[PDB]
Structure formats: structure tokens, C-alpha cells
Design a protein around this ligand. Structure first.
Ligand SMILES: NC(=O)CC[C@H](N)C(=O)O
Length: 219
């Protein structure tokens, strides 16, 4: 069958609930696979290994809220974008020093290894310390203990976490930065499959299944 990489934990796109993986990416990929009559296996893994896993054809494709960028297109191929996102700053709820990303100059920021938040921080934020972690809930804990002053990560992730597990200990500040889109990722040379997936995605957007899945996770 097809082996589909996904993220160890990127709420609300893929995350362990019970002993099953659930999420927008999980639901979207299942509807695509039905539409195309493809059998598959889901393989959660830490994000930093995903793009390499594709480069070496260890997996057939991936969904892990993966942002489409020109640099990654040198290494892998992408579907049409299926979700419009950004980055958001999150701080402890008692914080008054940090109102936007501008106030991160000179602060300790926690981020997730291998993701575009690291690339953004290095490019635009004169941090005192950029502390990187394999998974984003490690960064949330670094913030919660006061070992970092903020976390920078994908907007829908920061917002869903606050809403579901933050327990009033965190808040988002400022607006969504760096408008970006997520795509399904493939190794080079998967053009036939990639165009089939793009076709099935257009179908789901026209027949109401995309909107149903979007409303289930994002209301
Ligand atoms: N899976 C996540 O943690 C979000 C990944 C981030 N959008 C990236 O492509 O780098």
C-alpha cells in the first residue's frame, strides 16, 4: 500500500487520541484515499524526519501541516495548497512585555526543530536564545516553566492548544504572521499520484466534504 507520514503531534491536524490518530489532516487524507480508492498506512513521526524520509522514498507521501515553500520544492513536490495558515506568538497569560513579534527581540523563544518557525525566527527576530525542540508540546512546556519568554508556531496550532489544553496558562498576542499554505508532500517523481491527489482535492472542495472537515476542526 501507500505509506503516509504524519506528525507525532501537531494539533488539530494530527494527534494521538485514545490510541488512534485523529485530526484535520487525518480526516482529509482518509477522504482523499476513499475518493481515489487507495489503500494506505499512516506513519506518525517527528517532523524533522519527514522531508528526509520523502527524499529517500521511505514513505510515499506526507501530511503534517507541511508549508509549501520554494526551498522545499527543490527537494520534494507538493499538492495544491489545502489550508491557509501563518505563525502566531504565544506567551504566558500573565505577560505584559510581549505584545507582538517585535517584542521578541532580546528574548528567549522556544520553537520546534525542522519547521518554518525556526527559519522565521533566525531571519527576523534578534533573539537572546532560540531553543529548539523535536515536538511543539516540548516548547509549550518550556514556556510554561518560564524557561522561554514565548513560543512561535503555526497559528491554528497555537489557537487550538490554547482553546483545548492551555488551561488559561497561555495567550496569543499580535496577529497571524507570514501567510502560508500547507500542501501534501511527495518525493520527486510521484507526478501521477500527485495529480490524482490534486484532482481528488478539487472534488472534495466542490462536493462539501472539505467544508465538513474544516467545520469539524475549526468551527
Ligand atoms: N507540523 C508542524 O509543526 C507545522 C509545520 C510547519 N508548517 C512547517 O511546514 O515547517
Amino acid at each position: 500500500m501507500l505509506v503516509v507520514a504524519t506528525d507525532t503531534a501537531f494539533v488539530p491536524f494530527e494527534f494521538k487520541q485514545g490510541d488512534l490518530y485523529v485530526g484535520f489532516d487525518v480526516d482529509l487524507w482518509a477522504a482523499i484515499a476513499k475518493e481515489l480508492k487507495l489503500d494506505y498506512e499512516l506513519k506518525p513521526m517527528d517532523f524533522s524526519g519527514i522531508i528526509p524520509a520523502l527524499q529517500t522514498k521511505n514513505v510515499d507521501l506526507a501530511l503534517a501541516g507541511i508549508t509549501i515553500t520554494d526551498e522545499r520544492k527543490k527537494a520534494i513536490d507538493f499538492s495544491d495548497g489545502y489550508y491557509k495558515s501563518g505563525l502566531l506568538v504565544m506567551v504566558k497569560a500573565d505577560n505584559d512585555d510581549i505584545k507582538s513579534v517585535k517584542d521578541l527581540d532580546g528574548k528567549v523563544v522556544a520553537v520546534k526543530s525542522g519547521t518554518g518557525s525556526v527559519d522565521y525566527a533566525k531571519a527576523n527576530i534578534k533573539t537572546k536564545d532560540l531553543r529548539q525542540f523535536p515536538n511543539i508540546d516540548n516548547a509549550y512546556m518550556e514556556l510554561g516553566t518560564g524557561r522561554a519568554d514565548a513560543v512561535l508556531h503555526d497559528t491554528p496550532n497555537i489557537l487550538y492548544f490554547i482553546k483545548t489544553a492551555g488551561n488559561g496558562q497561555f495567550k496569543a498576542v499580535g496577529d497571524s504572521l507570514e501567510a502560508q499554505q500547507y500542501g501534501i508532500a511527495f518525493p520527486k517523481g510521484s507526478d501521477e499520484l500527485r495529480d490524482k491527489v490534486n484532482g481528488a482535492l478539487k472534488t472534495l472542495r466542490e462536493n462539501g466534504t472539505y467544508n465538513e472537515i474544516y467545520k469539524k476542526w475549526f468551527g
